[PDB]
Design an enzyme around this catalytic site. Structure first.
Site, PDB file in Angstrom:
ATOM      1  N   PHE A 360     -31.970 -18.030  20.183  1.00  0.00           N
ATOM      2  CA  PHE A 360     -32.974 -16.958  20.182  1.00  0.00           C
ATOM      3  C   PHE A 360     -34.384 -17.517  20.016  1.00  0.00           C
ATOM      4  O   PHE A 360     -35.337 -16.764  19.748  1.00  0.00           O
ATOM      5  CB  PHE A 360     -32.646 -15.866  19.122  1.00  0.00           C
ATOM      6  CG  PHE A 360     -31.237 -15.279  19.229  1.00  0.00           C
ATOM      7  CD1 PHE A 360     -30.515 -14.969  18.081  1.00  0.00           C
ATOM      8  CD2 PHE A 360     -30.664 -14.984  20.479  1.00  0.00           C
ATOM      9  CE1 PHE A 360     -29.217 -14.389  18.153  1.00  0.00           C
ATOM     10  CE2 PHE A 360     -29.366 -14.398  20.578  1.00  0.00           C
ATOM     11  CZ  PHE A 360     -28.635 -14.115  19.410  1.00  0.00           C
ATOM     12  N   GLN A 362     -36.376 -18.648  22.309  1.00  0.00           N
ATOM     13  CA  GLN A 362     -37.189 -18.501  23.505  1.00  0.00           C
ATOM     14  C   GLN A 362     -38.096 -17.266  23.396  1.00  0.00           C
ATOM     15  O   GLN A 362     -37.898 -16.396  22.512  1.00  0.00           O
ATOM     16  CB  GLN A 362     -36.303 -18.339  24.730  1.00  0.00           C
ATOM     17  CG  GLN A 362     -35.593 -19.586  25.190  1.00  0.00           C
ATOM     18  CD  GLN A 362     -34.577 -19.249  26.258  1.00  0.00           C
ATOM     19  OE1 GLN A 362     -33.448 -18.825  25.963  1.00  0.00           O
ATOM     20  NE2 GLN A 362     -34.978 -19.414  27.503  1.00  0.00           N
ATOM     21  N   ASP A 364     -39.394 -13.671  23.963  1.00  0.00           N
ATOM     22  CA  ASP A 364     -38.506 -12.527  23.853  1.00  0.00           C
ATOM     23  C   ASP A 364     -38.260 -11.808  25.188  1.00  0.00           C
ATOM     24  O   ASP A 364     -37.238 -11.147  25.330  1.00  0.00           O
ATOM     25  CB  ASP A 364     -39.015 -11.554  22.758  1.00  0.00           C
ATOM     26  CG  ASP A 364     -38.750 -12.057  21.322  1.00  0.00           C
ATOM     27  OD1 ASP A 364     -38.216 -13.191  21.153  1.00  0.00           O
ATOM     28  OD2 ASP A 364     -39.032 -11.369  20.290  1.00  0.00           O
ATOM     29  N   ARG A 407     -32.759 -45.400 -19.723  1.00  0.00           N
ATOM     30  CA  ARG A 407     -34.080 -45.148 -19.108  1.00  0.00           C
ATOM     31  C   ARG A 407     -35.050 -46.339 -19.291  1.00  0.00           C
ATOM     32  O   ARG A 407     -34.860 -47.152 -20.209  1.00  0.00           O
ATOM     33  CB  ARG A 407     -34.698 -43.859 -19.676  1.00  0.00           C
ATOM     34  CG  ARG A 407     -33.907 -42.548 -19.355  1.00  0.00           C
ATOM     35  CD  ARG A 407     -34.318 -41.894 -18.035  1.00  0.00           C
ATOM     36  NE  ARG A 407     -33.764 -40.535 -17.862  1.00  0.00           N
ATOM     37  CZ  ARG A 407     -34.270 -39.626 -17.037  1.00  0.00           C
ATOM     38  NH1 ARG A 407     -35.380 -39.896 -16.330  1.00  0.00           N
ATOM     39  NH2 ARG A 407     -33.701 -38.421 -16.944  1.00  0.00           N
ATOM     40  N   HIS A 479     -31.410 -36.993 -20.715  1.00  0.00           N
ATOM     41  CA  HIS A 479     -30.229 -37.314 -19.904  1.00  0.00           C
ATOM     42  C   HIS A 479     -30.392 -38.676 -19.217  1.00  0.00           C
ATOM     43  O   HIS A 479     -31.530 -39.106 -19.014  1.00  0.00           O
ATOM     44  CB  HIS A 479     -29.895 -36.197 -18.897  1.00  0.00           C
ATOM     45  CG  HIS A 479     -31.045 -35.708 -18.061  1.00  0.00           C
ATOM     46  ND1 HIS A 479     -31.380 -36.273 -16.849  1.00  0.00           N
ATOM     47  CD2 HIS A 479     -31.879 -34.649 -18.221  1.00  0.00           C
ATOM     48  CE1 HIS A 479     -32.376 -35.594 -16.303  1.00  0.00           C
ATOM     49  NE2 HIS A 479     -32.716 -34.620 -17.131  1.00  0.00           N
ATOM     50  N   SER A 484     -31.327 -39.582 -10.375  1.00  0.00           N
ATOM     51  CA  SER A 484     -32.443 -38.712 -10.764  1.00  0.00           C
ATOM     52  C   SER A 484     -32.260 -37.271 -10.254  1.00  0.00           C
ATOM     53  O   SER A 484     -31.929 -37.073  -9.074  1.00  0.00           O
ATOM     54  CB  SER A 484     -33.756 -39.260 -10.173  1.00  0.00           C
ATOM     55  OG  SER A 484     -34.810 -38.286 -10.249  1.00  0.00           O
ATOM     56  N   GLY A 485     -32.495 -36.289 -11.132  1.00  0.00           N
ATOM     57  CA  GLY A 485     -32.541 -34.883 -10.761  1.00  0.00           C
ATOM     58  C   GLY A 485     -33.638 -34.553  -9.761  1.00  0.00           C
ATOM     59  O   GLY A 485     -33.389 -33.899  -8.744  1.00  0.00           O
ATOM     60  N   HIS A 486     -34.860 -35.005 -10.031  1.00  0.00           N
ATOM     61  CA  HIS A 486     -35.940 -34.834  -9.058  1.00  0.00           C
ATOM     62  C   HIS A 486     -35.598 -35.395  -7.647  1.00  0.00           C
ATOM     63  O   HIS A 486     -35.731 -34.672  -6.659  1.00  0.00           O
ATOM     64  CB  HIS A 486     -37.260 -35.424  -9.582  1.00  0.00           C
ATOM     65  CG  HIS A 486     -37.978 -34.508 -10.517  1.00  0.00           C
ATOM     66  ND1 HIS A 486     -37.604 -34.356 -11.838  1.00  0.00           N
ATOM     67  CD2 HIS A 486     -39.021 -33.669 -10.319  1.00  0.00           C
ATOM     68  CE1 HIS A 486     -38.390 -33.461 -12.414  1.00  0.00           C
ATOM     69  NE2 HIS A 486     -39.255 -33.023 -11.515  1.00  0.00           N
ATOM     70  N   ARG A 546     -41.996 -39.746 -10.605  1.00  0.00           N
ATOM     71  CA  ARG A 546     -41.243 -39.954 -11.850  1.00  0.00           C
ATOM     72  C   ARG A 546     -41.380 -41.401 -12.354  1.00  0.00           C
ATOM     73  O   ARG A 546     -41.570 -41.620 -13.537  1.00  0.00           O
ATOM     74  CB  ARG A 546     -39.776 -39.538 -11.723  1.00  0.00           C
ATOM     75  CG  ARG A 546     -39.550 -38.142 -11.106  1.00  0.00           C
ATOM     76  CD  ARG A 546     -39.917 -37.011 -12.061  1.00  0.00           C
ATOM     77  NE  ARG A 546     -39.014 -36.946 -13.207  1.00  0.00           N
ATOM     78  CZ  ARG A 546     -39.302 -36.371 -14.367  1.00  0.00           C
ATOM     79  NH1 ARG A 546     -40.484 -35.803 -14.570  1.00  0.00           N
ATOM     80  NH2 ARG A 546     -38.393 -36.352 -15.334  1.00  0.00           N
ATOM     81  N   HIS A 552     -38.250 -43.344 -14.314  1.00  0.00           N
ATOM     82  CA  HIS A 552     -37.177 -43.855 -13.439  1.00  0.00           C
ATOM     83  C   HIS A 552     -37.522 -45.224 -12.830  1.00  0.00           C
ATOM     84  O   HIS A 552     -38.691 -45.609 -12.780  1.00  0.00           O
ATOM     85  CB  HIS A 552     -36.801 -42.851 -12.321  1.00  0.00           C
ATOM     86  CG  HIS A 552     -35.848 -41.765 -12.747  1.00  0.00           C
ATOM     87  ND1 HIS A 552     -34.532 -42.006 -13.087  1.00  0.00           N
ATOM     88  CD2 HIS A 552     -36.017 -40.422 -12.846  1.00  0.00           C
ATOM     89  CE1 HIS A 552     -33.939 -40.862 -13.383  1.00  0.00           C
ATOM     90  NE2 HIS A 552     -34.816 -39.886 -13.239  1.00  0.00           N
TER      91      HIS A 552
END
Ligand SMILES: [Ca+2]
Ligand SMILES: [Ca+2]
Ligand SMILES: [Ca+2]
Lengths: 597, 597, 99, 597, 50
Positions: A360, A362, A364, A407, A479, A484-486, A546, A552
């Site tokens: 879809f 393209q 209309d 860390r 943690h 890494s969460g990020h 980070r 990190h």
């Protein structure tokens, strides 16, 4: 008779569709994850003792002695049991923080500062999130991150060297990396890293394939403090999507007529059109020059769970990201998928086309169909945000259940304790002997920086300190370091956006932040950037942010990016069972190949 | 031997968890959806003709005659077939727009304006998204909305009367509803609505239960133009969450010490803290008093797919929401879950507590666990956004596959054509004879207002027009009236937020927009507001915004909020199978009762 | 008693042999196929244009300009859809050859 | 909700497709096969003995006495056990050939010739191939061939009569059947057969339906030595596809232009274009007049496994098939599906259209699709060859596991032993009393022919012999007579070609071999031949070729043709589950009806 | 004229060719292709005859 299909009730067809997706996810099989061996390798140095020391494992929160090693090994062993079970009572039964005052109930800290503030302890942040299942995508435990670098490796010497150089370069402006004013420090950084084996010698035949893929070569001004995703090393440091605003309401093309918004200039002043309101790209400004955890006693209280969250100060106002420190601040408080939602919003307002292999797309008059719920703005806005918690469950399993990597602040504590003791003719933490031996020039710079910080903090005559200076008062989140969460959310989210949009679209005008004012100027870069490349750059911005904060290492980031890519690919494959239409997502992956889903 | 269960591999347990959730959803059963019967009831008035007229059905895009009835019934019958099939080629074979010029290839429009602009057609927006399955939540087809009001009904006369009164009141300021300078109009509006049976008479024993639930009583200044969700009719018209900013970075409690942000004042100037950057609550300003589709030819062009999107003019800058028209502008461009994500961000920055029946919510000295991925900020941030597309699939099924109700603009067209013809002693569209007979005073005000607009638009002597004035140049989106995309998403999203937060928390200071200046003022309301009440108000604000723009009726909105709530509840129930922890969500439903999930 | 297997009818043994071979093939698993990324990488060089050029992709049969680039990107995008669908009518609706 | 299908993963869809084909094959059910009762009917004629004689069963290889009956009945009974088990050791344990010389280890033969050559034994050729399963088509044991004719029947008298007449007519030229030179022999053949009840009297009500279908009537010059498949009795004896070459490379139509190959004349000189090389239709030439196994001692050594393979002599060169003997030579060494692959190649080179009910067969401006892999040349080339081993497994089950019918050479040995003994007033093998009584004139001709052969072989004064003369030195292959490997592969292969091509296409020019030279001439035949008819004729050519060699009876051939047709139909039905397209194969069957698959 | 580098795709390492000579010019890399004459015996020789 003529071969056929048969229909069934809508309910049964929905049930069978959900089961088929589960079965697709099952038939992928599973792989094991392998740790690096450090947890039981390193031992207590006391004669007449048979305990691991756990010095290279995450132990933040468990009570430490004066050198930053844990006092009671059962405290860590219990923590591991609690991680693998998830039971709430078992977690409540763990030991958190130091000894308490019988009368007040308060923790007794080492530092005058923590005691004057009457700080309480903070707790581990979802230590068993790696046990949770999900209704969609790869299960948290089905996929793997490879072994983390060890403390004695050339890789780790290069990683921690890099982090000290970032910490000491926090007041450098991105647009000024090449300026004569900064020439002395910048060249010191480049020369120091190029002096390390990791960077100056290539991998050897027989090295682990993962190490081969993430190994870096010659350091230049053009690659200093950058990532390695394709697109990140081309053009200016910061992705367009973290500095530019967007096209604004009232700018539009209606048939043969062009209308101009009265607010059109907001685009080039950092305002993203956000429906009928706006988002500003200007970040809050942390006190320039002020770093944290440069005093051993404060550092140790933090390692024993002292809750310094919210202790930073700030200048008034806001400004487009200007220094290395401003990027650290950006990633201190960002709301999950924030960066990628904002890039998505810029892309929609500017009318960048969706992936042309969707239906879809393209004009209309040709297809009689516009897009919104499926294959349009609403579809992409749900998908870019939804993949985030799925990526997070996977990285929690690696963080807590597999690797438990310490860390960077804790690595700096080992280095500092090691170096101070060596000067008085003793050996403590021989594991970081290579780092101390090789990083002489950088550590003397840290020592001078740290003396100044401890004086400004109210100590006229401070003990020498080689600690890694932190951007945040609390240092790292509660943690482990790997991954890494990020960076996992970054990998997942930009995978979605590259796949959903026509990611080969070329950027028209390239901007950067002005050297002298808080405004955008036209870059003098002469090549061509694409949407996909600038999406990758954005992922690498948030992830290295980070690192610039001190929380990190390089390896945490790159390997997490790859993990998030896998989670997002898996969700798209399972979802493809739910549509009637004929289509696929074209995805350019981080490795430079393309998958059609 | 002692009874037991047993372990299996992680991969099998994940597979089994997903099938179990599919089974729980299948075991809910399904219910049918009943339409109001209009589609085949109304007939073409020509003798020797054997067709339905389809005049009460959504036909925007199919070719219309000079009165706004479709020319060829097969165009609608083919549209209905393509909706239920979803096949892309069948969709491309439909008839869209009027006859085209052979040499240029462009549509030939009725209005000088559309032809001078050389407009092309726009197409239907996901006319088969109601066929799409989903990996989570109730299937789109398993749930129902009740039959829509008919054109001959007291409910409808009431609904369309309200919308005209909103359109004519678009320049009224919220803070001035009760003020002497608006007394004449506000009392006209209140008297007019109280003169209608639907408002001045109660439901009768034996009426459909859905009608009894949604019927409104006596109209007052305190309920004028408001919703009926619990909380919406107490305190100021606008939800706190669409005008206030939030606590800012640098305001924090660190032990015994309170720190204050240098930017603390930004909270009361409508800046939401968005990570380390900001969102501003100030909306773009559409040209006061300019409405659209007030001319019959332009109106018919729009019914024939003329793409006027982007034709509005704006003033410079932005302001906190001031007039009825400003709320219409807000809901013209909002990105999906925008209002609810922004409320979520305010609640997070101000530190409003999570639902206390979740795990790990106590002080960490007690539970040794903080929250993020599960039961914390990342969890709620992903949940509030992901419900949106699942709710949109269900409402698309009701829109296109079940009810196909005409949009309010099309009702207005029928009223205008009928009144004009009746002055010539001719009867056209007798189906709206009752609205024409009862809304004389309102329609005379619309005719004067429409003449002034047509004069502004450059018509030296406009024909009389009783059309419903539109806030948007293009009028409604390209999809049916019942239900609403905005309202369904509102229902789902505010359901997630009330369940995740401790929604019983009371609001401290209540604000309003100033009468004199672009700023907040403290309100004189005495009483208590709650988070849950203000979240409901917010849902009602976005949903009635659509009504104030001229694009939905009352019943579209309320019935849609109920449907979105059902979808959110089902997603939470199925996901509960994925966790090891002992916990529940406590959710105050729209009906005043509480379910624990 | 002494462990044993058992006989069944010839017809059932044949059926079971065929399913067993289908099962061995299913138990190999499957692998994805990765393309080189060119298809969406190369762009039309005209300014104010928003299309892939498709110049490194097989387009034999679709109409080309004087330089050998396809004239209409939708001709290729439709060819790709018909390839993945196999539907005979969708194939007959493609554009093949010049004016 | 609207009834639907659901999708699953590609892997599961492939698995389910293969299972569905297996289930289709299972649901056909199975039928038993019935033998003719001879195996236990005929007994040893010795008084004080309770053994079957097994004289009407295949026993080639098991040690025989001086009359050609087996010495030890346990040898045959063990052979039957080995056939039904397939165990390799059990086969190695069988008795093969006669008694051996203690010093050399060599078999002691009866004949001077076999002893002078020091011949070893040859073994049974896949005696348990009827136990093997297959991934596609009808299982080997699911289908049946009806009971073989018995030695005492009118059918067998006619069959063996026919084979003696072929053997004595080996030097007759096909193009000369009607010539005055051959008038005396040819008319003797026709008169002799028309004198037999099988041919001169019809079937009776209540006879087995199989016998009714294969029974032949009046013998003419036009049907002499021909088959009964539709098309075989029309036009010249040899199918076009075994004498003509094809269109050659360089003959082509390019738009409005016709190009002519420089090698175009190769077409009419027996060269099939075979990609860019050629195949020649000219067969090797076996020494005219030289036949084998006409001496009882040589005949008996062959029955005791004496390996005469490769003992034939040949004239130099090659020629288009000219005499009855040349057709026997053709089918002595042909490679499986050779004949049908060659017909397929002629059909492709000449551009005969494929079956018009396949997809994509239209001009490409209409369908945008050419054919190769599916529905084209590659598809037909794989299918025509692949069905052959499936057909062979089925015929091996009938040959070895069910019927064990003796080959024609062994029937002639019974006839000869019977006749010689009757002349000295004794009865041996009363089972062939009818054949000896009825075939007087033919056997006297065989006796004269055999005397001449035995003299040329080095025996100046030979014992009288009425044996059936063999075209090959080894006589029949080492496996039973009923059915035939050649005819089953023929039935399967031409079924594929009739179905895949537009088999109703009419042949344009008809050719035959010249009476005087080794070249092709235009036939004087006046009617019309079709591709299907000429494919059937080809199947009957290869099948009767075996009979002309002396190694099969009429009934073996016809019933095998029907078996192969069933195997090929079954494979097409199972394969039809694998395509997405809308199509079918139109197949004209041997019985004159059509099935659409 | 240059070898593959550590870290290149394994499929590239497998198919990369080295120094071009008269003995390998225009040939494949399947084991057996680069020894003896260019054309396979099976595309030029006939066979033993009947
Ligand atoms: Ca479109
Ligand atoms: Ca807690
Ligand atoms: Ca064709």
């Amino acid at each position: 008779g003529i071969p056929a299909d048969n229909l069934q009730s809508r309910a049964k067809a929905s049930f069978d569709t959900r089961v088929a997706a589960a079965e697709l996810a099952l038939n992928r099989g599973v792989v094991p994850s392998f740790a690096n061996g450090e947890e039981l390798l390193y031992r207590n140095p006391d004669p007449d003792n048979t305990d691991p020391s756990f010095i290279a494992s995450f132990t933040k929160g468990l009570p430490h002695d004066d050198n930053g090693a844990i006092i009671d090994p059962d405290d860590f062993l219990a923590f591991v049991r609690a991680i693998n079970s998830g039971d709430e009572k078992e977690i409540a039964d763990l030991t958190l923080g130091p000894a308490r005052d019988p009368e007040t109930g308060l923790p007794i800290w080492r530092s005058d500062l923590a005691n004057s503030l009457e700080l309480e302890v903070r707790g581990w942040e979802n230590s068993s999130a790696g046990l949770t299942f999900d209704l969609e995508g790869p299960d948290a435990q089905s996929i793997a991150m490879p072994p983390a670098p060890v403390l004695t490796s050339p890789e780790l010497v290069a990683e921690i060297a890099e982090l000290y150089l970032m910490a000491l370069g926090r007041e450098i402006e991105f647009s000024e990396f090449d300026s004569p004013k900064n020439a002395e420090y910048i060249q010191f950084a480049i020369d120091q890293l190029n002096g390390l084996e990791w960077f100056n010698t290539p991998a050897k035949l027989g090295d682990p394939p993962a190490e081969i893929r993430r190994r870096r070569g010659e350091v230049t001004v053009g690659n200093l403090f950058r990532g390695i995703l394709p697109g990140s090393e081309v053009g200016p440091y910061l992705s367009q999507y973290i500095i530019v605003g967007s096209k604004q309401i009232g700018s539009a093309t209606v048939g043969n007529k062009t209308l101009v918004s009265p607010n059109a200039a907001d685009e080039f002043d950092g305002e993203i059109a956000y429906g009928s309101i706006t988002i500003s790209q200007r970040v809050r400004i942390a006190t320039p020059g002020r770093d944290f955890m440069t005093d051993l006693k404060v550092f140790l209280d933090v390692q024993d769970a002292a809750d310094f969250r919210g202790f930073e100060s700030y200048e008034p106002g806001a400004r487009l990201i200007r220094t290395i420190r401003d990027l650290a601040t950006w990633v201190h408080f960002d709301a999950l998928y924030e960066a990628y939602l904002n890039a998505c919003l810029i892309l929609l307002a500017n009318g960048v086309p969706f992936d042309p292999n969707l239906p879809f797309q393209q004009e209309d008059k040709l297809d009689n169909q516009d897009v919104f719920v499926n294959f349009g703005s609403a579809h992409v806005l749900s998908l870019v945000t939804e993949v985030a918690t799925r990526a997070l469950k996977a990285v929690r399993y690696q963080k807590f259940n597999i690797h438990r990597r310490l860390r960077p602040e804790a690595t700096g504590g080992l280095i500092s304790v090691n170096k101070i003791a060596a000067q008085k003719g003793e050996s403590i933490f021989p594991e970081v002997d290579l780092a101390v031996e090789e990083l002489g020039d950088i550590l003397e710079k840290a020592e001078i920086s740290n003396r100044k910080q401890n004086i400004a903090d109210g100590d006229p005559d401070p003990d020498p300190s080689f600690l890694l200076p932190m951007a945040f008062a609390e240092g790292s989140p509660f943690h482990p370091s790997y991954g890494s969460g990020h960076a996992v959310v970054a990998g997942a989210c930009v995978t979605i956006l590259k796949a959903f949009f026509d990611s080969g679209i070329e950027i028209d005008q390239v901007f950067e932040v002005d050297k002298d004012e808080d405004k955008l100027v036209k870059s003098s870069f002469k090549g061509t950037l694409t949407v996909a490349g600038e999406l990758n750059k954005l992922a690498d911005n948030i992830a290295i942010g980070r690192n610039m904060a001190g929380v990190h290492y390089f390896s945490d980031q790159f390997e997490s990016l790859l993990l998030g890519e896998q989670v997002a690919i898996g969700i798209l494959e399972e979802q493809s069972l739910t549509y009637g239409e004929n289509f696929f997502f074209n995805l350019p992956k981080f490795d430079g190949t393309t998958i059609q889903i």
